[PDB]
Specification:
The structure is cut from a larger assembly and holds chains A (50 residues), B (7 residues), C (96 residues), D (64 residues) and E (79 residues).
Chain A lengths: L3 E7 L6 E6 L10 E5 L4 E6 L3
Antiparallel strand pairs in A: 1-2, 1-4, 3-4
Chain C lengths: L8 H4 L13 E3 L12 E3 L15 E3 L11 E3 L5 H8 L4 E3 L1
Parallel strand pairs in C: 1-3, 2-4, 4-5
Chain E lengths: L43 E2 L8 E2 L4 E2 L14 E2 L2
Antiparallel strand pairs in E: 1-2, 3-4
Classes of the chains: A mainly beta (50), C alpha/beta (96), D mainly alpha (64), E little secondary structure (79).
Bound molecules: erythromycin A (ERY).
The site of erythromycin A has 4 residues of chain B.
The structure holds six RNA strands.
Family (chain D): Belongs to the bacterial ribosomal protein bL35 family.
Subunit structure (chain D): Part of the 50S ribosomal subunit.
Protein name (chain D): Large ribosomal subunit protein bL35
RNA sequence: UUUUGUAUAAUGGGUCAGCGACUUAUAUUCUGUAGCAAGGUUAACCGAAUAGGGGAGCCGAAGGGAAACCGAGUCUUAACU
RNA sequence: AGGACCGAACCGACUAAUGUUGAAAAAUUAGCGGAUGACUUGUGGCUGGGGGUGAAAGGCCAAUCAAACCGGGAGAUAGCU
RNA sequence: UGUAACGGGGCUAAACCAUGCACCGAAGCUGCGGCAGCGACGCUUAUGCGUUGUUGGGUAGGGGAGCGUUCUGUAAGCCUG
RNA sequence: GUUUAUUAAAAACACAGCACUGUGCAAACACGAAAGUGGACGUAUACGGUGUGACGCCUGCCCGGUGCCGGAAGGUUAAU
RNA sequence: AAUUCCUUGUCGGGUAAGUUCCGACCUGCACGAAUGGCGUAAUGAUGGCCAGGCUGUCUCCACCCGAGACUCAGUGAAAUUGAACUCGCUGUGAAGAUGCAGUGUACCCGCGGCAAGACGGAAAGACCCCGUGAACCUUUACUAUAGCUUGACACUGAACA
RNA sequence: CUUUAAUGUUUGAUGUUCUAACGUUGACCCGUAAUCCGGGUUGCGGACAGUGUCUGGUGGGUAGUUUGACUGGGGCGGUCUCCUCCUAAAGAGUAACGGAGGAGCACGAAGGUUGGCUAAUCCUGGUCGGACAUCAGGAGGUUAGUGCAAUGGCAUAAGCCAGCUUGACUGCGAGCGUGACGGCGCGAGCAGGUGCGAAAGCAGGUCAUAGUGAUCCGGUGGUUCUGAAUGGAAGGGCCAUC
């Protein structure tokens, strides 16, 4: 049912990425939020969100 | 048895 | 392995192998050896000749597996922190 | 003739020191994004085959 | 017509009780569907996400009752 | 014999005699027993042929890790209370 | 003249009884059909097994046929008795 | 199918209620003798005695100990016209 | 007329007659790795296949489906 | 109706009486035109119905002649069979008893007769289901495949447009 | 050192012509008194036809196979995993083709924190206004609400509203619960970094219990861990994910 899976890439150049889902249909603006990147061990902005 | 019977 | 038609343990669980192949040609040496090397020089092979390694081997550590007495010089091998200490403390010498 | 190791099992267990066997957890190969980090986290480190399955594994790996 | 069906086991219920060994952090009382049939208290609290009541430090389990009209409260008496 | 259960009206046998069904080989593990012991044992083969020789090799004395590697530790992690 | 008529030989096999450890692994007796025809018969030939042959029934292919018989794979396999 | 709804005879108590004392009755309990396993205690320990307490139904099945048959040695022995 | 030799002789099969369809001959078609042979020492008034079944009076509507015949356009499409 | 379930439909005929039959109706559960429709002389060991004759088919069986059955002599089978000292009844019971309980009855043994019982004999059910059974048959089941068919390259060349 | 165009080429498509591969189950000749074959001459056909390899189509003509289980016989029907109540006998657990209902999600706020707030229903009064809109007081005291079934919870609210936010964080995990097992669940605390709060604090998703899929094969990103002489690379492993 509708809600699709998204990747969340670290804005640091590291390849790290969290993973989750969102409603592609109702909220098209690309989700971003501060999350902990563990290869640099700093809280950093994560972009990509459909 | 057969068959003849039855049945 | 068959456990009724149920998916068997050795199939429910994932594979995780990867075989070193380099490991296959590395031996490990106990302190208890070397005294039996015959010639006070414990060499790249030599151990090999004392039948404590096996021809194909190309690498070897010396490992604190206890008990070395006769002073011995080990050459071309690797040797643990504890083994070096035991060798040296028995009048031994560890040249690369 | 020599027994043949049940080759599939050979690629999923390794005899340990005291004679145990250790394996990789299931449930960690795909459809992951929906699983708690805590759960997935606990599924990384290998674990011992239970007492109940020992019988099976050994019969699969006579030359373990 | 079209009946059958049922949830599984699920368990739920006191698992430690009274004076109990109550080691370090036992899940003494798992009747979730709770924060209610039982309540966090003394040297035990936690009260996990599925309302499980569990030891927070070693000792004996208790079971009391208090002043917001009744209410049960499980707690751990240091031994 | 088979069965929850058989005098069963459920199976099998007319009777006697002879024959008639858990073996053999090779692997592996456990118990007993024997040898020796941090060592134990040789395979083919030689052979004065059950001896003697042959230690190629196999098992064990070190483990941990997918692995490099490290080693009475090691793996996990930047790091472990 | 006639796959014409009545009717023996000859060829068939509609009914009945008998027979059913038979006289006979399909007959005997009394009746019955065809009887110059797509008739009937002696001898010899050809067609072979997923193949033959079949005015067609799955009929027949040596008392065997929804895949002949003999030998082989062979101690097929049998979670059944 | 034939009395066929105390098992029968038969019963007016040989039926029913209460109280009580008898007795019959089992491979249960006890007594006498005996075997075997496990205990302990005493005689006495390459043990076996004596007590003594106790245990000994049994299918699938697990464990233990044995009889006898064929054949090799022991055996050019031993038995045997 | 034929048939289930041995529980079915019939309304079943066959039949002459009818129709469709294939086949131009080195025929279609069948047996056959192939050579070859049958079809036939025949040739469309012939031959194979299929359905129907003497004769009499007749055989209506539907080509959307499936099949077959025809279709030098275009769309999609194999090795290469 | 070789098609009609309802159905012995309804009407007419034949019979003392007719679920069949003959003739009709049409409400054709669910005829129909070459997997031919409706007719049809003749033919049929073809199906259904009727009548005359005929009769032991029947009422209802009698007698007779022959072949067995029975007796003697000779020869001499068969299937089946745990073992038999192998009764009735009512009851019990792996639930339909010669064999258990209770009870009744019954001297021992043939021969000729009869089939109610020995869940009689005979074939390790075919129907019923079951087996991760078999085989043949079907198809727009699956995967292949002979055949048919398509193009490319080879055998395979030259011209001119 | 050309498109609006054309002479020499190496090269496809189509159409005519030729003979010389190839066909000839036309004729004649010889082997040869021979309807086989071969050679020969010749007519016909002719780079077609046919055949080999490759290839798309068709292919019950032929072959091998599959065609589930439960089940108050079997078939037909229904059912097959997950959550909730009862049956269930006051710990857990507990069957039937027993009785009733849900699920295969939703939410970047519907999550975190901080501050604040408190319902249903009825009586009385009140323009349009009624049995039931909004206001007022009073009863009542959660009979309301909860993102969805049912149960158990919830006022310190888990219910209602708002500000700031990303803790729906990475590595770990004393100790527990629950499973034959694979597995699933709960968890204080430690380390790093973060949010809200004056602060004590709280936060490792949501009031909780459904919202799901083993392994294999493979994709992607990362990763000096491996790299079949050596350096690389392929491939593999590991971490993340499909
Ligand atoms: C002539 C000679 C043959 O007799 C007949 O054919 C009679 C006339 C059969 O009945 C015929 C006629 C008839 C009506 O059976 C009476 C018919 O139903 C059966 C199928 O075949 C018999 C009896 C059949 O039995 C019956 O088979 C049935 C499956 C079950 C029945 N039983 C339950 C009692 C059983 O007795 C059956 C199988 O032939 C008996 C088996 C052992 C045989 O094969 C034997 C060798 C017979 O062929 C035979 C005696 O030689």
């Amino acid at each position: 049912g509708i809600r699709e899976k998204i990747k969340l890439v670290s804005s640091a150049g590291t390849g790290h990425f969290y993973t989750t889902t969102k409603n592609k249909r109702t909220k098209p603006e690309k989700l971003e939020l501060k999350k902990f990147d563990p290869v640099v061990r700093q809280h950093v902005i994560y972009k990509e969100a459909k | 048895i057969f068959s003849i019977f039855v049945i | 392995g068959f456990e009724g038609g149920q998916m068997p343990l050795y199939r429910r669980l994932p594979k995780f192998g990867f075989t070193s192949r380099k490991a296959a040609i590395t031996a490990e040496i106990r302190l208890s050896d070397l005294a039996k090397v015959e010639g006070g020089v414990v060499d790249l092979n030599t151990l090999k000749a004392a039948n404590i390694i096996g021809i194909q081997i190309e690498f070897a550590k010396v490992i604190l597996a206890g008990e070395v007495t006769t002073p011995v010089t080990v050459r071309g091998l690797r040797v643990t922190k504890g083994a070096r200490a035991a060798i040296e403390a028995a009048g031994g010498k560890i040249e690369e | 003739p020599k027994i043949k190791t049940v080759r599939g099992a050979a690629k999923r267990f390794k005899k340990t020191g005291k004679g145990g066997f250790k394996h990789k957890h299931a449930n960690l190969r795909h459809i992951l994004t929906k699983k708690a980090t805590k759960r997935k986290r606990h599924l990384r480190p290998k674990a011992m085959v239970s007492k109940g399955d020992l019988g099976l594994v050994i019969a699969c790996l006579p030359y373990a | 017509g079209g009946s059958t069906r049922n949830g599984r086991d699920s368990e739920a219920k006191r698992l430690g009780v009274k004076r109990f060994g109550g080691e370090s952090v036992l899940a003494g009382s798992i009747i979730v569907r709770q924060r209610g049939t039982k309540f966090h208290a003394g040297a035990n609290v936690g009260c996990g996400r599925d309302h499980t009541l569990f030891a927070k430090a070693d000792g004996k389990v208790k079971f009391e009752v208090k002043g917001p009209k009744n209410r049960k409260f499980i707690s751990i008496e240091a031994e």
